[PDB]
């Protein structure tokens, strides 16, 4: 038996995925000055730091 | 027996596919400075790194 087929096909598929991570640090301190002079810890260490 | 055929044919087919992948890293740290001097681990290693 003869049967006619209408070819009408349309398929479409998409997918996506993304990720992000970020972190930052910034800590800075000038040498501490008390009494007109620069404070010293130990023998050669200041009250200062720098992180980045 | 004589039969007349009307030639009327029109077929059309398309297909497509694509893919993407991407990844990136960027980690950078300046040498850590505490107490006015540059911190050293071991004997010659800083607190710094650079990844790309």
Write down the residue that tokens 């960027």 correspond to: B26
CB B32 within 8 A of CB A51: yes
Residue B20's Cβ-side half-sphere holds a number of Cα atoms within 13 Å equal to: 7
- Per the CB < 8 Å rule, is B29 touching A41? no
Tokens of B16: 């497509």
- The resolution in angstroms reads 3.2
Instruction: Mark yes or no for CB contact B37/A49 under 8 Å.
Output: no
CA distances (Å), origin B1, targets A1, B4, B7, B41: 21, 10, 19, 102
- Under 8 Å between Cβ of A42 and A34: no
When scoring A18, A25, A46, A47 by the number of chain B Cβ atoms within 10 A, the one with the most, hence best to mutate, is A46
């Amino acid at each position: 038996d003869i049967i006619t087929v209408t070819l009408d096909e349309t398929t479409s598929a998409t997918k996506s995925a993304n990720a992000d991570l970020s972190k930052t640090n910034e800590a800075q301190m000038d040498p501490l000055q008390v009494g007109g002079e620069e404070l010293q810890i130990g023998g050669k260490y200041n009250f200062s730091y720098d992180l980045n």
